[PDB]
Design a binder for this molecule. Structure first.
Ligand SMILES: Nc1nc2c(ncn2[C@@H]2O[C@H](COP(=O)(O)OP(=O)(O)O)[C@@H](O)[C@H]2O)c(=O)[nH]1
Ligand SMILES: [Mg+2]
Length: 384
């Protein structure tokens, strides 16, 4: 059975993302490896909802002989902003489409920035529209500039695969080679995703209660990794404490192990009922640390998406929903940024009133009153 990998086409509008997506499904349909989805159906993307946010996004699926790919493609720049920050459809690798004619453009830069900010681990470049460029040295110019763009945002720009071709020619036989070259790069450059159960154990604590004569139980849904009776864990958030999970219980049965997705109850050895609380996390020791201060790429929701008309500003103190708890925090904006209007995104500095377990790449909501006013992805954690 083939591993499932999430990918998507990013880049500036009209550079050929939707055309490349169609060409991939057509090329693979000829080998019985994909449903052919024509360009018109990919381009007219349907709507879907990430909580109150509506995003236009096309999902298609196709297989190489080795892999099953889940592929996303969006019409508008705003769709990519919302999809990448809210994590509606996450990506193991991004296919950066850059037209060789006009070359890299504002959304080329911004989508690379967003990919880095949201933690997309690998980039593959497809230089499109080469059928329109007669001077081959100018195609190399575009490649070099895209490589420098990736390096500017800490991607290994010298090492990423860069495929040149014409998505349109492929969509209309020798023009299939860039498609095959692209798929081989996806097969070889993007590694098989490590699955949640080999990741370090983490479970946010939802509820705490005491069994008299036995000890303190914390309940929560395991986010990643495994927990087994006898394992050592740390309680992170709000001074770090070590303990042993004596027992893992789910559906009135003691488990040999709890895995990601299991809502379990963990009996904590020697933990007083008043010293652990909702919002802390159980974690494999050393795998995550408490922080009061961190940076995060934050999208400010529009009023129509459930947010407010008011922008974010220096000193704004909303609530930060970090896993199972919400904590007051104070906003600081980067240099030269005085406000963030709804619909915009920026990297903000956040200082919570008390430390919580938080890590790079973690997503969180920002709420003010009853409205969700922002969505963020942690980009940096600051030492306590
Ligand atoms: N000449 C040429 N035109 C292309 C190529 N790929 C796409 N186009 C034209 O792209 C216009 C926009 O590209 P499209 O895929 O719809 O947009 P995108 O998904 O927003 O980048 C249409 O004319 C596409 O057919 C190509 O490889 N060569
Ligand atoms: Mg498109």
């Amino acid at each position: 059975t083939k591993p499932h990998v999430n990918v998507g086409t990013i880049g500036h509008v009209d550079h050929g993302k939707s055309t490349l997506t169609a060409a991939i499904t057509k090329y693979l349909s000829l080998k019985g490896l994909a449903q052919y989805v024509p360009y018109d159906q990919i381009d007219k993307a349907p709507e879907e909802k990430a909580r109150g946010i509506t995003i236009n996004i096309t999902h298609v699926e196709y297989e190489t002989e080795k892999r099953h790919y889940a592929h996303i493609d969006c019409p508008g720049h705003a769709d990519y902003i919302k999809n990448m920050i809210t994590g509606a459809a996450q990506m193991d690798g991004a296919i950066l489409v850059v037209a060789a004619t006009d070359g890299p453009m504002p959304q080329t830069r911004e989508h690379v920035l967003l990919a880095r900010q949201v933690g997309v681990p690998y980039m593959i470049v497809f230089i499109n529209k080469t059928d329109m460029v007669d001077d081959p040295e100018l195609i190399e110019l575009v490649e070099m500039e895209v490589r420098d763009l990736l390096s500017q945002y800490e991607y290994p720009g010298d090492e990423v695969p860069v495929i040149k071709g014409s998505a349109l020619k492929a969509l209309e036989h020798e023009a299939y080679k860039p498609i095959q070259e692209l798929l081989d790069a996806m097969d070889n450059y993007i590694p098989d995703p490590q699955r949640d159960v080999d990741k370090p154990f983490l479970m946010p604590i939802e509820d705490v209660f005491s069994i008299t004569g036995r000890g303190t139980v914390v309940t929560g849904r395991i986010e990643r990794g495994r927990i087994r009776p006898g394992d050592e864990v740390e309680i992170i958030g709000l001074e770090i404490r070590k303990t042993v999970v004596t027992s893992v219980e789910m559906f009135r049965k003691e488990l040999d192990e709890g895995i990601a997705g299991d809502n379990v109850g963990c009996l904590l050895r020697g933990i007083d009922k008043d010293e652990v609380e909702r919002g802390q996390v159980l974690a494999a020791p050393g795998s995550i640390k408490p922080h009061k201060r961190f940076k995060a790429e934050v999208y400010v929701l529009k009023k129509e998406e459930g947010g407010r008309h008011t922008p974010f500003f220096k000193g704004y103190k909303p609530q930060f929903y970090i896993r199972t708890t919400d904590v007051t925090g104070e906003i600081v904006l980067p240099e030269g940024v005085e406000m963030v209007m709804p619909g915009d995104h920026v990297e903000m500095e956040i200082e919570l009133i008390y430390p919580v377990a938080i890590e790079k790449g973690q997503r969180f909501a920002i709420r003010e009153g009853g409205r969700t006013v922002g969505a963020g992805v942690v980009t940096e954690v600051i030492e306590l």
